[PDB]
Design a protein around this nucleic acid. Structure first.
Length: 175
RNA sequence: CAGGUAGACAGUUUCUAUGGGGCGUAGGCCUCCCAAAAGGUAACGGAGGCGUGCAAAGGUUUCCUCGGGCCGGACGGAGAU
């Protein structure tokens, strides 16, 4: 449905709105990294496992084990400790997962405005964020530590920014 | 025979480097400069280190390759994923 809608409404409008040419070379999502950072500073392995076994449900894919980059900060943080995870889906697993947030999960969240600020990175890429009060068909508020949010960075093959929101707007993403 | 005490007595040591000696400091090895474009080459002449660490930071095969900054994102208000 999400993937099918792409080549039957999404791409079409992307051919008339922008420069007229072939079929491809149009804004197309390549991956969706819904990273979910964990409360740093506090040295606890519980929060780490509570994260890896958290996103592995909504995406059904084993998270990552990023390591603190070697640097000299103010805190007493060392290099070699895991403090975050970022899963990215591709192909069908991407369009399918992306269709979820669009259809379900939202506006399931109580009091969901939808008005997004400026944002944008500067190269056909868009990213969003969810507060510590979200909801997903996979998430179970029955056996979890504490309500925590996560980040969702969706990158596309768009060249410019004006070709980023034009792909998510006609797609179904709240705007 | 043997354990203490035993310079009262006897035999000696108690360094050198150092533009006096002495005090201090300096008296191997490893990096740069003074050595004036092959090396070698002085002076307590100018700035820093070592007397180890490591079943592996050993070898090999494959693969992966930064720092920092800008524009964005829940927990960001200078840096953290």
């Amino acid at each position: 449905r999400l993937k099918t809608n792409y080549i039957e409404k999404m791409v079409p409008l992307l051919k008339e709105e922008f420069s007229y040419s072939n079929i491809l070379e149009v804004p197309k999502v390549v991956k969706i990294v819904v990273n979910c950072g964990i409360g740093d500073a506090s040295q606890n392995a519980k929060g780490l496992d509570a994260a890896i076994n958290e996103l592995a449900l909504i995406t059904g894919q084993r998270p990552v084990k990023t390591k603190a980059k070697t640097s000299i900060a103010g805190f007493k943080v060392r290099e070699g400790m895991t403090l975050g995870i970022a899963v990215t889906l591709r192909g069908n697993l991407m369009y399918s997962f992306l269709d979820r947030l669009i259809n379900l999960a939202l506006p399931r969240t109580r009091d969901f405005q939808g008005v997004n600020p400026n944002s944008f990175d500067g190269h056909g890429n868009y990213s969003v964020g969810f507060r510590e009060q979200s909801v997903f068909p996979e998430i179970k508020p029955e056996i979890v530590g504490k309500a925590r949010g996560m980040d969702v960075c969706i990158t596309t093959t768009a060249k410019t920014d004006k070709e980023a929101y034009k792909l998510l707007s006609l797609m179904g993403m709240p705007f």
